[PDB]
Design a binder for this molecule. Structure first.
Ligand SMILES: Cc1cccc(C(=O)c2ccnc(NCc3ccc(C(=N)N)cc3)c2)c1
Ligand code: NA
Lengths: 10, 27, 147, 102
């Protein structure tokens, strides 16, 4: 259920 | 240190909905 | 939290999320205590009976959060751990005595309306607030129910 | 299940022997418990996922929030005659200091 977080955070 | 003072509450002199429950308990 | 309310915005600005990189998800709570230091329970990092054994590269800390699941853009900051420390006499084998760990962030977090450190007690504040019947406040994104 | 937003609960700290007597697990001085007594009738507890969060108290002398405990352990969530357990932050302050100097 956890929304994808920006890729920049590796 | 500004520790423990919340920008949206203490620093604006607001209280949250329940902090007062805490202060009461120190009867 | 079982039997609580929704927090208000800004209500707990030191509340931190330990967030798993591997399968992306909530590990634990934690708390911001300076611009570079986050505090948590040692058992979130190391608990052998449960294979819980996390390093720097397994973890993100998410600071400034209200929503459990969403990426709160413009509001949250995501940091990376430089150094994790677990109490040397942490008793995971028996009773979780000294269940404490310090997490050092790579780059300082900038404070804001939603991100701000809690104070740590001096002997005197402990002395007068830590008594039976005085109320305290707990906050988290953990289960609402047992199961 | 899980909640969609951060949850909060105020809870009273409980006397040491009531803490000890609610469990078979050996309680130490770097722990306190908190929760409502079964009679009291107000419920509330920490639970799985809440581990590592802050147990905080607002100082009435300086209006500042203090973290007294770290959400640690409990035997199930929100059962009567049972209590949530917290890491006594102040008992472990020397170590915290030690780790911060470097
Ligand atoms: C053998 C033993 C010793 C101490 C605690 C327990 C637990 O059941 C336990 C073990 C590890 N982690 C836990 N954390 C999640 C949690 C659960 C309940 C509460 C609470 N009920 N206040 C807070 C956090 C629990 C078992
Ligand atoms: Na209980």
């Amino acid at each position: 259920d956890f929304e994808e977080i920006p890729g920049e955070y590796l | 240190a500004d520790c423990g003072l919340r920008p949206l509450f203490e620093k604006k002199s607001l209280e949250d909905k329940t902090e007062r429950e805490l202060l009461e308990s120190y009867i | 939290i079982v039997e609580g309310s929704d927090a208000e915005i800004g209500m707990s600005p030191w509340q931190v999320m330990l967030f798993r990189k591997s399968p992306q998800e909530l590990l634990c709570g934690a708390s911001l205590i300076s611009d570079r230091w986050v505090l948590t329970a040692a058992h979130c990092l190391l608990y052998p009976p449960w294979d819980k054994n996390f390093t720097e590269n397994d973890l993100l800390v998410r600071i400034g959060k209200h929503s459990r699941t969403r990426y709160e853009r413009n509001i949250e900051k995501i940091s990376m751990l430089e150094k994790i420390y677990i109490h040397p006499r942490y008793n995971w084998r028996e009773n979780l005595d000294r269940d404490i760990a310090l997490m050092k962030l790579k780059k300082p977090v900038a404070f804001s309306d939603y991100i701000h450190p809690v104070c740590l007690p001096d002997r005197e504040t402990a002395a007068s607030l830590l008594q039976a019947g005085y109320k305290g406040r707990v906050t988290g994104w953990g289960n609402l129910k047992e199961t | 299940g899980q909640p969609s937003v951060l949850q909060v609960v105020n809870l009273p700290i409980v006397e040491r022997p009531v803490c000890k007597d609610s469990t078979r697990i050996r309680i130490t001085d770097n722990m306190f418990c908190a929760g409502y007594k079964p009679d009291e009738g107000k419920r509330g507890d920490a639970c799985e996922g809440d581990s590592g969060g802050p147990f905080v108290m607002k100082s009435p002398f300086n209006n500042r929030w203090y973290q007294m405990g770290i959400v640690s352990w409990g035997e199930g969530c929100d059962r009567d005659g049972k209590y949530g357990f917290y890491t006594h932050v102040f008992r472990l302050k020397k170590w915290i200091q030690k780790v911060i100097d470097q």
